[PDB]
Each structure stands twice: as structure tokens, then as C-alpha cells.
Design a protein around this ligand. Structure first.
Ligand SMILES: *[C@@H]1O[C@H](CO)[C@@H](O[C@@H]2O[C@H](CO)[C@@H](O)[C@H](O[C@@H]3O[C@H](CO)[C@@H](O)[C@H](O)[C@@H]3O)[C@H]2NC(C)=O)[C@H](O)[C@H]1NC(C)=O
Ligand SMILES: *[C@@H]1O[C@H](CO)[C@@H](O[C@@H]2O[C@H](CO)[C@@H](O[C@@H]3O[C@H](CO)[C@@H](O)[C@H](O)[C@@H]3O)[C@H](O)[C@H]2NC(C)=O)[C@H](O)[C@H]1NC(C)=O
Ligand SMILES: *[C@@H]1O[C@H](CO)[C@@H](O[C@@H]2O[C@H](CO)[C@@H](O)[C@H](O)[C@H]2NC(C)=O)[C@H](O)[C@H]1NC(C)=O
Ligand SMILES: *[C@@H]1O[C@H](CO)[C@@H](O[C@H]2O[C@H](CO)[C@@H](O)[C@H](O)[C@H]2NC(C)=O)[C@H](O)[C@H]1NC(C)=O
Ligand SMILES: CC(C)CCC[C@@H](C)[C@H]1CC[C@H]2[C@@H]3CC=C4C[C@@H](O)CC[C@]4(C)[C@H]3CC[C@]12C
Ligand SMILES: CC(C)CCC[C@@H](C)[C@H]1CC[C@H]2[C@@H]3CC=C4C[C@@H](O)CC[C@]4(C)[C@H]3CC[C@]12C
Ligand SMILES: CC(=O)N[C@@H]1[C@@H](O)[C@H](O)[C@@H](CO)O[C@H]1O
Ligand SMILES: CC(=O)N[C@@H]1[C@@H](O)[C@H](O)[C@@H](CO)O[C@H]1O
Ligand SMILES: *[C@@H]1O[C@H](CO)[C@@H](O)[C@H](O)[C@H]1NC(C)=O
Ligand SMILES: *[C@@H]1O[C@H](CO)[C@@H](O)[C@H](O)[C@H]1NC(C)=O
Ligand SMILES: *[C@@H]1O[C@H](CO)[C@@H](O)[C@H](O)[C@H]1NC(C)=O
Ligand SMILES: *[C@@H]1O[C@H](CO)[C@@H](O)[C@H](O)[C@H]1NC(C)=O
Ligand SMILES: *[C@@H]1O[C@H](CO)[C@@H](O)[C@H](O)[C@H]1NC(C)=O
Ligand SMILES: *[C@@H]1O[C@H](CO)[C@@H](O)[C@H](O)[C@H]1NC(C)=O
Ligand SMILES: *[C@@H]1O[C@H](CO)[C@@H](O)[C@H](O)[C@H]1NC(C)=O
Length: 1175
């Protein structure tokens, strides 16, 4: 047991001093630094602590060993062997057995003039089984705050760059900048030159050093645990063998139907070898009297109707308009809305992000060749230094932005959230320029010498993409890359277009400007939106032909909605102009009814305005989208009713001396039941479709329903009187379709042989529609709701094409958990001693899957960080001795003592009241260079404490990130699976009830919460609306069940074919497509009703003739009344500007129209001819 030294010598460089050389006998260490020995490696701490050692050597070891402690504190296993190496290497008592000093030089004392000898160089003899057990047991640890390979950092060279021998040589070599003097190691397993290397006991990541420190986790050790689980496969289409298993269930059934159908034509060829009408009669008489009444009292009626219109539409003064998207697309009391309501109250609302996806088209990738050694590393086009300067200039200019509002000048610093303030207040900008801190000088300053550059921006970039949380470059660059705001900048948030682990290959640059969003405050929101407007205008007009910018803003969507919503104003006006043109010329043929067409158009707009005004009075706000889609619908229905009545009158011949009233009463009594049926069926259809939970469709449905009902009523009354006035007029000088239907079409269509083919064809199309039913999309694209000429479309394309990370997730653990106990922490903390099914571990596994579960990254929990901070080893914590105030980590150390005693007892987790005593100081910790990251910048928001009564903890969250989400399927999949993870954790916590529960909050959950129940919502809505139609028909048409059931079956056929057309044109099944289907099922009656009544009330002999008589009579008015009108309406809307209209309203209505026309005018005729109700 000989010495190699005692004492230390003068300064070598920086603060580094070469130890003084002295190989004599040992010396018990002074009672002064008991504290280091215990702490460094107590394996030396017994009795007489005789050691060739000095307390200033212990404290310079302890002091120099800070980073390795930072990257390896997680496994005491590897940390403790590395420590066992330095302490023994430094002042073990048998230093001469395994050490050989080779170089040494004289030292001068400025105190006594005595020349000593510094140890410049020496050879270190290290056992092989020690380096093997150390590197192999800690070698799998990745570095924290990154997916690196913590050895990738503490080795100076990448995972594949160093082995176990080279890494130790590099660590001991001062050529790196850490070793104060170089130690030359020598591989040895057997004693050579009498210099026996070191081979003390070694411990792996699978074993704990002491009975109170749990072993390291299998995240950081590969023998304890493994990738054991794997998602299952999605086997569907169901029963593939078959070709969809629905292509077959339908095709096979159809073949059976075709055989059972043509086999009765075949067997026929072979054989060749006071309630019944009590309610339908009182209506006729009443309408007969009331039409007469309104015709002989025109003045009173029309005047009262105008007074009513005005009295009802003056309530339009209280009209309020909603433009805020949350209110539009989210139910006020949906589960996701309540979750969001809880999150905004305790943690403040999620902030607003202004992205910027920069791209350099005019540049090519260039190559980086490392000077010392290394394979070439190509950098994408956007990572050029010149392009980086131009983008930095753009960013610094975006920071200028002022745009004073309401006699007040606000700035980005003023609104941008600064996490750790007011200490550092610059603010959060998440751009790749933060690695250089937005400094042209920092970006260009180089650390090399002529003929080669040692370090370069790539050198810094490469280092900090590997470790964005370093406080120094540590590759001799000596430049910190934490960011001006203080806090890491994760490379996946500031880049896009790279390849899975090669930020070198980045093709795009992401630049975020997070801005604080405020809860119950309007001046701040006004100021922020006013700032965002100027930001948008600037970015839109910026001229840098070298760059292609795609931008957005939190307020961009709402603004876009109001800009696309006002550009169709011309469209609704033109639609009515063309409708009036058609009505004016077709309504009968100075045999012109222009006056009546104008009267009808004004009555329709009056009905629209009256609905809007009444509901504004009630307090329902306008969506301005409705104000554009509602007029069309109401116009269609109102014009149809007007034509029915006027034409039945025109074709009615006047009896004997009848003046005017008798004729009008007769016409109204025979035509009103049918028009009344259509109008009432539609009103009920609309109102009933107004029961879905979505405020936009709910309010729209109400508005449209009321407008149809009031328009029908007002029409029948004011318009029959005005018809009387115009009929009296023209009686003082002041058909070709019907001919066709009766002469050549009704007979043709009803031939014996054409009828079976037609029925076969329609049932075949119905089978197809039913077959392709389940293959309809779910959800709305989110990029099609914007006009085509909008920059948000380009931004969405750019996202889908470049971005690699998604929306952040917060797993909010509601208020009520304990947190001050070992088990209470095990249910949560993803750590050493905490459970294996803990919240953090479950979120970690989810992030490990990443395709099944879309949660992409690790939890970034706050409690793990808090414990890491409070550990006595770290020494970050330090309280004042007399004041009990937090002594910063950079302090003169006058009298500050460690918070937790550095003992075996102190080593445990702080479970008791110390927990809550020190938690606030941690949350108050700043990013100290000695200590580390500190928490203030990351967890102050995430942890809530209620003052008083023991300061019990509030709701906390563990925020992670989603995977890049590009379509509705992707969003719905993410919501579902986040809810599932939460469900698992809630189960595992085992609450004695539901006092509290985990739930995830992300920004899009409220908009996508409807697609978790849209299928049962659709089923219920369609079924209920159709049952209402059924009942209304079977009641109003008398009580005949056969006609009612036939009509209901035909409209159901119409809906199924509607679903087929949906699938075929790529329309999606969101709450708008669903409202339109429930509406179409109500608009179909206008076709299906006339024919069936003309057939039912008929007294010919046989079924065929009844059908042909009904066809002629009523279908002459039905083809001219409904089809052409609705066609004029839809063709003007076919040129939309919001995409949402042009896709859903236009396609759904065109489909409905042509489908209803064919069905009514062809398939109803034929089906009744075959199986129609006799009489
Ligand atoms: C995404 O990033 C990776 C990591 O930088 C790129 O891989 C490297 O790709 C470059 C491209 O041409 C190669 O040069 C690198 O090395 C080959 O390495 C040998 C020595 O290992 C050299 O002698 C060769 O001259 C060549 O440089 C290669 N290195 C590694 C470790 O993969 C990748 O190219 C990039 N994506 C694309 C599409 O380029
Ligand atoms: C994470 O999620 C993806 C979902 O896309 C999972 O699918 C994998 O990645 C892609 C899917 O596009 C496929 O890998 C294939 O790689 C070959 C290599 O040239 C390429 O030719 C194919 O076009 C395709 O890209 C494949 O569906 C699947 N990969 C494997 C190994 O099964 C996958 O679970 C994860 N993807 C990643 C990034 O590993
Ligand atoms: C290397 O191993 C030796 C022997 O196992 C250790 O010396 C023992 O060390 C313990 C640790 O405190 C002492 O309590 C014993 O008194 C020592 N006895 C003997 C006979 O060695 C030594 O501490 C180990 N060194 C390291 C760095 O682990
Ligand atoms: C952001 O914080 C930095 C330090 O982290 C502050 O100072 C930096 O920016 C100054 C702007 O004038 C520069 O002059 C300084 O050189 C730079 N810091 C250093 C290393 O000197 C600054 O308060 C913040 N940024 C500002 C104010 O622009
Ligand atoms: C290159 C990187 C990985 C090195 C990181 C670990 C650093 C801190 C290691 C490597 C070399 C080590 C130093 C080598 C020489 C001495 C002199 C000795 O009398 C006290 C310990 C001291 C001062 C060591 C302190 C810890 C040390 C500086
Ligand atoms: C047409 C009638 C019924 C009016 C109602 C339509 C409204 C509610 C629809 C039309 C377009 C829809 C938007 C489609 C796209 C987006 C972008 C996404 O980032 C948030 C949801 C949001 C903002 C939707 C909200 C709901 C929405 C605004
Ligand atoms: C820049 C500017 O003129 N701001 C106006 C100021 O002129 C005006 O006197 C004052 C009174 O309302 O309001 C503010
Ligand atoms: C100038 C300076 O000290 N910069 C930091 C510091 O944390 C560290 O001491 C230094 C030496 O490696 O490197 C880095
Ligand atoms: C440790 O044993 C050898 C190297 O010492 C190696 O084959 C093995 O993979 C290591 N164990 C690991 C990596 O878990
Ligand atoms: C814009 O920023 C530059 C740089 O900080 C500054 O000099 C200037 O005063 C700012 N305002 C301008 C140019 O209007
Ligand atoms: C674009 O790149 C050229 C390259 O020389 C540079 O001169 C110019 O300032 C950059 N910005 C422009 C052209 O707006
Ligand atoms: C979890 O609890 C203990 C420790 O791992 C063990 O008995 C059990 O099998 C573990 N199972 C899982 C899935 O972690
Ligand atoms: C460190 O603590 C001292 C004590 O007053 C304080 O002045 C200083 O601002 C602190 N620095 C931090 C928290 O970064
Ligand atoms: C610290 O407090 C203890 C408790 O009384 C006291 O004995 C000791 O002298 C104090 N020393 C310093 C440096 O604060
Ligand atoms: C929830 O946990 C159960 C068992 O703990 C597991 O079978 C299921 O897959 C988990 N759900 C996920 C991972 O979505």
C-alpha cells in the first residue's frame, strides 16, 4: 500500500492543478472532509481513513464530476462503478500496484520559493473485467431529455464512435478539455510489471448498491425487461374470402330476388300453357270556405299578413352573430367540452401558435466533412448558412412587429409567454436559430485555425440536436444551446423533412411564436388578435425570393370563415334572380304571371326574414353560413307550393254562373290537402333533424324549419287572396307537358314489359347502394372547409408534407390525489421504486408503440424531475440555516446547509411533509449552470398548490406530444386511444369510487368528440325522422296504411341511394352530411306524395289504368313544379367559394333532386301499378 501523492500543486490551466507527487505511506484523512469521502465513495470511509489523498482533491473531484452525475445519476449501478474507478484511481491506499507515473515537472511556490514537481504524464493500469462490467452494465442508458444513448454524450463520440477502452482513454485524456491532466490507461487483466491493474467489485444495472436505493429501471437496463408487448393486427374487411363479404351478401341476395321475381313472370308464361274518411272530408270543406273567405275579403287578409310579417321580423334588432369556432362545432356540454372547461380553469388555456414552415427551393444540399474524423454528413437545403442568416433576419423582423391598437402599442414580448419570468423575459420562440440564440455573431463565430476549422455552426448544431439541454457545447466550441428564453428547444419541433433520426437532413424550418391565451379577459385577447392581424399581413407581403413561407395564426381560422362567408353574398342574390326568371316565364303559358311570381318571391324572403327575426328575438345567434344556405332551401319548397296551387287553378274550368270565390274555394279544397301534406312533412322533418348535438346544425335546423312553416302558412293565406285579386284582374284585359305525359309517356312507361325491367333496375341500384354503405368516410377533412384561394390550405398541405411532431397532450390528473406517500407516488412516478404499471410507465409504453397508440414521446413528468432535484447527491437544494429560505445553487455558501441529510435515511424519496416543504422552492428554481435545468421553466404551470391547510396539491399534468396527424381518421384514432390510456390508468389507481380521474386534454378534442357517437346519432336521427314522416303521412292521407307504407318505403330507398351517392362522390359523413340526409328524407315527400294521392283517390277499374291516370294528371305538375325549380336553385350554388358548400350542399342537393325525381316519377308509378292499394 504505497502512495503516489499527498497534497495538490498549483494551477495547470483554467482551475486545473496538477496533483503534487508523493509516493510514501498513507495518512488518515482529516476530520475536515469526511463529507466528501462519504459522498464520493464511502468504500474508503472506515476507522482511520488513511488515504494518499487531500480534501481539496476530494472537492475538486466532486466539483469536476457534475456532468457525468447529470447523465448517469439514473442508474446508481453505472454511476457507482465509474465512481469506484475515479476514487480508487485517485487516492486508494495501494496506488503503486496499479499506477506508474512517467511524466512530471518542477513546480515553484510563490509562497516559500520551494520547487516541487508536477505530474505531467503517467500510465494507468486498469483491469479489463472492470471496464467490461461497467460499460456493459450502464451502456444501454439513453440520455435524458433525448433518445441519444447517454454514452453518446459522456464519451465525446457517438454510440458507434467509441468502445469501452477508447471511451475511458478519451475521458482521461485532457485533449478533450475536461481532464486537468492526461492519464494513459493500459488494458490489463493480469498483473504486469508488478503493476496490477484495478479490478474491484462491479455492479450492473440489474442490482442495487444498497438496501434502500432501488435498482435502475429497464428503460436504462436491458436484462430486467423487454419489448414484450406488440399491438395486434386489424383483420377486416370482414370475411375477405368473398370479396368484401358484403359484395357477396348483397349480390347473392339479389340473384335470389331476380330469380324469385322473373320466376313468376316465368310461371305466368307457363300458366299460359267514422275514421276511414272522417278526417279528410272536414278539411276539404273548411278550406273551401276559407279560400272563399280570403278571396272576398282581400284587403283585411293581406294587410294583416303584412302587419304580421313586420311585427315578427322587427325582432331582428336583437340579432347576435357567433363566429367563434368552439361555439360552432362543439356542444356546450359535451364530455370534451367539460374536460376543456376544467383544464382552462386550473392551468390557463392552451396558448396560440403561429407556425412558419420555411423552405429553400433555390438551394442544393451540401456536404459536411468532419476535420478530425467522421463520415460525411449532408445538410438539407434550408440549413445553409446564408439561408440561415436570411431566416434569422426574418425572425428578428417578426419581432419588431408593433401594430398599435386602440391608442396603445403592444409588442411580441408583451404578449409572447415567457415561462421563467420575471427573471428572464425574452420569450419563447421555437426556432432552430435558438441554438445560436439569434446572433449573427454566434452563428458565424468559428473555433478553428487556418487550413481547417475545428468547430462550425454544424458542429454546434450536431451537438445540440443530440443534446438540446446542454448549458455548454462541451466539444471545445464552448457555446451554450439552451435558448434565449431558457429551456430546451426540441429538434422535432423546429425541423421537418428529415429522416427518422437525421436532423442533418432537415428540409424545412419550423418557427413557433407561442402567445399566452387568457381565460375571462377580452382586452388582452383583442390586443393579441390585433397583433396577429399585422403579423399575418407582414408575413404575407414579405419579399424574400429565396424563401417559401407557409404561415398561420390562432385567429386565422375564424377570420377565414368570415372572409369566405361573405363572398357568396352575390351567389344568393343571383340564385333568386334566376329563380324569378324561371317562375315568371313558366308559371302558365299577356298570359304572363310575372306579378304572381314577384309576389311569391317576396313572400319567400319575408318568411326567411321572419324566421331569422323571431329567433333573434328568442336569442339564438346567426352563423352567417346559415344565412346563406337557408334561403335556398326555403325558396325551393315555397316555389313548389305556389306552382301546385296556381296551376291547378289554371287547369280548372269554371262552372255555371260562379263569380270567383266559388271557383277558388273548389280549387283550394281539392289541392290544399296535398300541398299541406308536403309542407307539414317538411316542417316536421326539419325540426326533428334539429335535435342533434352540434350548435351549428342545431340552430340551422331550427331556423329552416320555422321558415318553411311560416312561409307555408303565410303563403296559403296571403297568396290565395292575392291570387284572387290577380284573377279578378286580367279578366278585364288590363299545356305541352301535360299533353306529353298523358299522350305518349304514361302509356309507354306502363307497358307490360318495360315495367319489370324498370323495377329490376331500381332494385339493383338499391342493392348496390346497400352494399357500399359501410364504406362511407367518417369526419370532415378540415382543409376543405376553407376556400381554394386561402393560405390556410397551403399551410395544411405543407404540414402534411413536412411536419414530424403533432399537438401536445396533457394528461390532467384531476384534483384529489395524495402525492405525499410512497404508494401515492408509485401510482404516478415512473421511477426506481415506483410501480411497474404506473401512470408514467404506461404513457412511456404508449410512446413506445407510436403507431397503434399515436402518443409519440415520453411523458416529461414533473415529479421525476423534482426528485432528481431534491437528491442530496445533486446538492442543488440548499436551505438557509437560520431563515429557512432557499439558497440558490450559485451562492457563496456562507452558511447554507443541504436540505436533505446526506445519509442512508436521507437517500430515500422525500415522502413526508418535507415533500411539500421543499416542492415550492423547487418550482421556484431557475436554470442554474452549476445545478442544471431547474424546474421553474417547465413545471410551475403544471403543478398547482392551494395555500393553507397543509398546502395540498392541485391538478397536475404530464404533457407529451402526438404523432403527426393528417386526416380525420388520424385524429379520431388519437382521441380514442388517449381515452383508452386514461381509462387504464384510472382503473389501476383503484379509487374508492370516482373522486378524481385521469383524462387527456388536447386542442382538437372538442372538435372531434362527435365522431365517437356519430354512427348511433345518425341511426337514431334518420330512424326518428322517418318514423315522424310515416306517421304524418298515414294520418294526413286518411288512415290508409298501404299507401303510407309504400311512400315510407320509397323514401327509405331514396335515403339508401343517398348513402350510395355519398360513398361514390367522396362526401364525408359529418354532422352536416347527416343534417342534409335527414332533410332530404323530408324533401322527398314533395315528389312521393302527389303521385300516391292521385293513385289512391281514383276510381278506374284496374291497377294499370289507375297508375297511368295518376301519372298524367299529377305528374304533369310534379315534373314542372319541383324538378326544374330545385334544379335552378342548385345550379347557381354549384359555383361555391367555401368548398364546404360546393361539396356538401351542392352535391347532396343535386343527388337528392335527381334521385327523388326518378323515384317519384318512375318507381312509384310502377310499384303502385304492381302492388298498389285497390279501390
Ligand atoms: C440522412 O442522414 C444520414 C445521417 O447523416 C445520412 O447518412 C449518411 O449519409 C451520407 C449521404 O451521402 C453519407 O455520405 C454518409 O456516409 C457514407 O459513410 C462512409 C463512411 O461511413 C463514407 O466513406 C461515405 O463517403 C459516405 O459518407 C452516411 N453515414 C451514415 C452513418 O449513414 C443520409 O444520407 C441522410 N439521408 C439522405 C437521403 O441522404
Ligand atoms: C410507425 O408507424 C408506421 C405507420 O406508417 C408503421 O408502418 C411502417 O412504416 C411504413 C408505412 O408507410 C412501412 O415501412 C415500409 O418501408 C419500406 C422500406 O423501403 C418502404 O419501401 C415502404 O414503402 C414502407 O415505407 C410499413 O408499413 C411499416 N414498417 C414496418 C417495418 O412494418 C410502423 O409501425 C412504424 N414506422 C416506422 C417509422 O418504423
Ligand atoms: C476494493 O476491494 C477491497 C477489498 O474488497 C476493498 O477494501 C475493503 O474495502 C471496504 C470498503 O469500505 C472496507 O470496509 C474494508 O475494510 C476493506 N478491506 C480489505 C481487506 O480490502 C476496497 O474498499 C475496494 N475499493 C473500491 C474502490 O471499491
Ligand atoms: C435574451 O437574453 C440574452 C442573454 O441570454 C440577453 O442578452 C443577449 O441579447 C442582447 C441583445 O442586445 C445582446 O446584446 C447580448 O450580447 C446577449 N447576451 C450576451 C451573451 O451578451 C437579452 O436580455 C435578451 N435578448 C435581447 C434583449 O435581445
Ligand atoms: C471528457 C469528459 C467525458 C470528462 C468528464 C468527466 C471529468 C469531470 C473527469 C475526466 C478527467 C477527470 C479529472 C482527471 C484528473 C483529476 C486530478 C485528480 O487529482 C482529481 C480528479 C481530477 C480533477 C479528475 C476530475 C474528473 C475528471 C475531470
Ligand atoms: C353550414 C351550416 C350548417 C353552418 C355550420 C358550419 C360550421 C359549423 C362548420 C363548417 C366548417 C367547419 C370547420 C371545419 C374545419 C375546421 C378547422 C379545424 O382546425 C377546427 C374545426 C373547424 C373550424 C370546423 C368547425 C366547424 C365548421 C366551422
Ligand atoms: C396617437 C394618438 O393620437 N392617440 C390618441 C390621442 O391623439 C388623443 O388625444 C387621445 C384622446 O382620446 O387618444 C389617443
Ligand atoms: C466559459 C465557460 O465556463 N463555459 C461553460 C462552463 O459551464 C464550463 O466551465 C466551460 C468549461 O468547459 O464550458 C462551458
Ligand atoms: C454484456 O456481455 C457481453 C459484453 O460484456 C455482451 O455480449 C452482452 O450483450 C452484454 N449484455 C448486454 C448488452 O445486455
Ligand atoms: C426594427 O428593429 C430594428 C432592429 O432592432 C430597430 O433598429 C428598429 O428601430 C425597429 N423598428 C423599425 C425599423 O421601425
Ligand atoms: C437571396 O440570396 C441572394 C444571394 O446572393 C442575396 O444576395 C439576397 O440578399 C437574398 N435575398 C433576397 C434576394 O431577397
Ligand atoms: C408488475 O408487478 C410485479 C413487479 O414487476 C410483478 O409481480 C408483475 O408481474 C409485474 N407485471 C407487469 C406487467 O409489470
Ligand atoms: C441565485 O440566488 C441569488 C440569491 O439572491 C439571486 O440573487 C440570483 O438572482 C439567483 N439566480 C438565479 C435564480 O438564477
Ligand atoms: C447552523 O445551525 C446550527 C443549528 O443551531 C448551528 O449549530 C450552526 O452553528 C449553524 N451554522 C451555520 C454556518 O449556519
Ligand atoms: C390497457 O391495459 C390492458 C391491460 O392492462 C391492456 O390489455 C390494453 O391493451 C391497454 N390498452 C391500451 C394499451 O390501449
Amino acid at each position: 500500500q504505497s502512495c503516489v501523492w499527498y497534497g495538490e500543486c498549483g494551477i495547470a490551466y483554467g482551475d486545473k492543478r496538477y496533483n503534487c507527487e508523493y509516493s510514501g505511506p498513507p495518512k488518515p484523512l482529516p476530520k475536515d472532509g469526511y463529507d466528501l469521502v462519504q459522498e464520493l465513495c464511502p468504500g474508503f470511509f472506515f476507522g482511520n481513513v488513511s488515504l494518499c489523498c487531500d480534501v481539496r482533491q476530494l472537492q475538486t473531484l466532486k466539483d469536476n464530476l457534475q456532468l457525468p452525475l447529470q447523465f448517469l445519476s439514473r442508474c446508481p449501478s453505472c454511476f457507482y462503478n465509474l465512481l469506484n474507478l475515479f476514487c480508487e484511481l485517485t487516492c486508494s491506499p495501494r496506488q503503486s500496484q496499479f499506477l506508474n507515473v512517467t511524466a512530471t515537472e518542477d513546480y515553484v511556490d510563490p509562497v516559500t520559493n520551494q520547487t516541487k514537481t508536477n505530474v505531467k504524464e503517467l500510465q494507468y493500469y486498469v483491469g479489463q473485467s472492470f471496464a467490461n462490467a461497467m460499460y456493459n452494465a450502464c451502456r444501454d442508458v439513453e440520455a435524458p431529455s433525448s433518445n441519444d444513448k447517454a454514452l453518446g454524450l459522456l464519451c465525446g463520440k457517438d454510440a458507434d464512435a467509441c468502445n469501452a477502452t477508447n471511451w475511458i482513454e478519451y475521458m482521461f485524456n485532457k485533449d478533450n478539455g475536461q481532464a486537468p491532466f492526461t492519464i494513459t490507461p493500459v488494458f490489463s487483466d493480469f498483473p504486469v510489471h508488478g503493476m496490477e491493474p484495478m479490478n474491484n467489485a462491479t455492479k450492473g444495472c440489474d442490482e442495487s448498491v444498497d438496501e434502500v436505493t432501488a435498482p435502475c429501471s429497464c428503460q436504462d437496463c436491458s436484462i430486467v425487461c423487454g419489448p414484450k408487448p406488440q399491438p395486434p393486427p386489424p383483420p377486416a374487411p370482414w370475411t375477405i374470402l368473398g370479396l368484401d363479404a358484403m359484395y357477396v351478401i348483397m349480390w347473392i341476395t339479389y340473384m335470389a330476388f331476380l330469380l324469385v321475381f322473373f320466376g313468376a313472370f316465368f310461371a305466368v308464361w307457363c300458366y299460359r300453357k267514422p275514421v276511414s274518411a272522417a278526417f279528410e272530408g272536414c278539411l276539404r270543406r273548411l278550406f273551401t270556405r276559407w279560400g272563399s273567405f280570403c278571396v272576398r275579403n282581400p284587403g283585411c287578409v293581406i294587410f294583416f299578413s303584412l302587419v304580421f310579417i313586420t311585427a315578427c321580423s322587427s325582432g331582428l334588432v336583437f340579432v347576435r352573430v357567433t363566429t367563434n369556432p368552439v361555439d360552432l362545432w362543439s356542444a356546450p356540454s359535451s364530455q370534451a367540452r367539460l374536460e376543456k372547461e376544467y383544464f382552462d380553469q386550473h392551468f390557463g388555456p392552451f396558448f396560440r401558435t403561429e407556425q412558419l414552415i420555411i423552405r429553400a427551393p433555390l438551394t442544393d444540399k451540401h456536404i459536411y466533412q468532419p476535420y478530425p474524423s467522421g463520415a460525411d454528413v449532408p445538410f438539407g437545403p434550408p440549413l445553409d448558412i446564408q439561408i440561415l442568416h436570411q431566416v434569422l433576419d426574418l425572425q428578428i423582423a417578426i419581432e419588431n412587429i408593433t401594430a398599435s391598437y386602440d391608442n396603445e402599442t403592444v409588442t411580441l414580448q408583451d404578449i409572447c409567454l415567457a415561462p421563467l419570468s420575471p427573471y428572464n423575459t425574452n420569450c419563447t420562440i421555437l426556432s432552430v436559430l435558438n441554438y445560436f440564440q439569434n446572433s449573427h455573431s454566434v452563428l458565424d463565430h468559428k473555433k478553428g485555425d487556418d487550413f481547417f476549422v475545428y468547430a462550425d455552426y454544424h458542429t454546434h448544431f450536431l451537438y445540440c440536436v443530440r443534446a438540446p439541454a446542454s448549458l455548454n457545447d462541451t466539444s471545445l466550441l464552448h457555446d451554450p444551446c439552451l435558448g434565449t428564453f431558457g429551456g430546451p428547444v426540441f429538434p422535432w419541433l423546429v425541423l421537418g423533412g428529415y429522416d427518422d433520426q437525421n436532423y442533418n437532413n432537415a428540409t424545412a424550418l419550423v418557427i413557433t411564436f407561442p402567445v399566452n391565451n387568457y381565460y375571462n379577459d377580452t382586452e388582452k385577447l383583442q390586443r393579441a388578435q390585433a397583433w396577429e392581424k399585422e403579423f399575418i399581413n407582414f408575413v404575407k407581403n414579405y419579399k424574400n425570393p429565396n424563401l417559401t413561407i407557409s404561415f398561420t395564426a390562432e385567429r386565422s381560422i375564424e377570420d377565414e370563415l368570415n372572409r369566405e362567408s361573405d363572398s357568396d353574398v352575390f351567389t344568393v342574390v343571383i340564385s333568386y334572380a334566376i329563380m324569378f326568371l324561371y317562375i315568371s316565364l313558366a308559371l302558365g303559358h299577356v298570359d304572363s304571371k310575372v306579378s304572381l311570381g314577384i309576389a311569391g318571391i317576396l313572400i319567400v324572403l319575408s318568411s326567411v326574414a321572419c324566421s331569422l327575426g323571431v329567433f333573434s328575438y328568442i336569442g339564438l345567434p346567426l352563423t352567417l353560413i346559415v344565412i346563406e344556405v337557408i334561403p335556398f332551401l326555403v325558396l325551393a319548397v315555397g316555389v313548389d307550393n305556389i306552382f301546385i296551387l296556381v296551376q291547378a287553378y289554371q287547369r280548372d274550368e269554371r262552372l255555371q254562373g260562379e263569380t270567383l270565390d266559388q271557383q277558388l274555394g273548389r280549387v283550394l279544397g281539392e289541392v290544399a290537402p296535398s300541398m299541406f301534406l308536403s309542407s307539414f312533412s317538411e316542417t316536421v322533418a326539419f325540426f326533428l333533424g334539429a335535435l342533434s348535438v352540434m350548435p351549428a346544425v342545431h340552430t340551422f335546423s331550427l331556423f329552416a324549419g320555422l321558415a318553411v312553416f311560416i312561409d307555408f302558412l303565410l303563403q296559403i293565406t296571403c297568396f290565395v287572396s292575392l291570387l284572387g285579386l290577380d284573377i279578378k284582374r286580367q279578366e278585364k284585359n288590363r299545356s305541352c307537358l301535360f299533353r306529353f305525359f298523358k299522350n305518349s309517356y304514361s302509356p309507354l312507361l306502363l307497358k307490360d314489359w318495360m315495367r319489370p325491367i324498370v323495377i329490376a333496375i331500381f332494385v339493383g341500384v338499391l342493392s348496390f347502394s346497400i352494399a357500399v354503405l359501410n364504406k362511407v368516410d367518417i369526419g370532415l377533412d378540415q382543409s376543405l372547409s376553407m376556400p381554394d384561394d386561402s393560405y390556410m390550405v397551403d399551410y395544411f398541405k405543407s404540414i402534411s408534407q413536412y411536419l414530424h411532431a403533432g399537438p401536445p397532450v396533457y394528461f390532467v390528473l384531476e384534483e384529489g390525489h395524495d402525492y405525499t406517500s410512497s404508494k401515492g407516488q408509485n401510482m404516478v412516478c415512473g421511477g426506481m421504486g415506483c410501480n411497474n404499471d404506473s401512470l408514467v410507465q404506461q404513457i412511456f409504453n404508449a410512446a413506445q408503440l407510436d403507431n397503434y397508440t399515436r402518443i409519440g414521446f415520453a411523458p416529461s413528468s414533473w415529479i421525476d424531475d423534482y426528485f432528481d432535484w431534491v437528491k442530496p447527491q445533486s446538492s442543488c437544494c440548499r436551505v438557509d440555516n437560520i431563515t429557512d429560505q432557499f439558497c440558490n445553487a450559485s451562492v457563496v455558501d456562507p452558511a447554507c446547509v443541504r436540505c436533505r441529510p446526506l445519509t442512508p435515511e436521507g437517500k430515500q424519496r422525500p415522502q413526508g411533509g418535507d415533500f411539500m416543504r421543499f416542492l415550492p422552492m423547487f418550482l421556484s428554481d431557475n436554470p442554474n449552470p452549476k445545478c442544471g435545468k431547474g424546474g421553474h421553466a417547465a413545471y410551475s404551470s403544471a403543478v398547482n398548490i392551494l395555500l393553507g391547510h397543509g398546502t395540498r396539491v392541485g391538478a397536475t399534468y404530464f404533457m407529451t406530444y402526438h404523432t403527426v396527424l393528417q386526416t380525420s381518421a388520424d385524429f379520431i384514432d388519437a382521441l380514442k386511444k388517449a381515452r383508452l390510456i386514461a381509462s387504464n390508468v384510472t382503473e389501476t389507481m383503484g379509487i374508492n369510487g370516482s373522486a378524481y380521474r385521469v383524462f387527456p386534454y388536447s386542442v382538437f378534442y372538442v372538435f372531434y368528440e362527435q365522431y365517437l357517437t356519430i354512427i348511433d346519432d345518425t341511426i337514431f336521427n334518420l330512424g326518428v325522422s322517418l318514423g315522424a314522416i310515416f306517421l304524418v303521412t298515414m294520418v294526413l292521407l286518411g288512415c290508409e296504411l298501404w299507401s303510407a307504407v309504400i311512400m315510407c318505403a320509397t323514401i327509405a330507398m331514396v335515403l339508401v341511394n343517398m348513402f350510395g351517392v355519398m360513398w361514390l362522390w367522396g362526401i364525408s359523413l359529418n354532422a352536416v352530411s347527416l343534417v342534409n340526409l335527414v332533410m332530404s328524407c323530408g324533401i322527398s315527400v314533395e315528389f312521393c306524395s302527389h303521385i300516391t294521392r292521385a293513385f289512391t283517390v281514383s276510381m278506374k277499374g284496374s291497377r294499370v289504368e289507375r297508375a297511368e291516370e295518376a301519372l298524367a294528371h299529377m305528374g304533369s305538375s310534379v315534373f314542372s313544379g319541383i324538378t326544374l325549380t330545385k334544379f335552378g336553385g342548385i345550379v347557381v350554388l354549384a359555383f361555391a367559394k367555401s368548398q364546404i358548400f360546393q361539396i356538401f350542399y351542392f352535391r347532396m342537393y343535386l343527388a337528392m333532386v335527381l334521385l327523388g325525381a326518378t323515384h317519384g316519377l318512375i318507381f312509384l308509378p310502377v310499384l303502385l301499378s304492381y302492388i298498389g292499394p285497390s279501390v
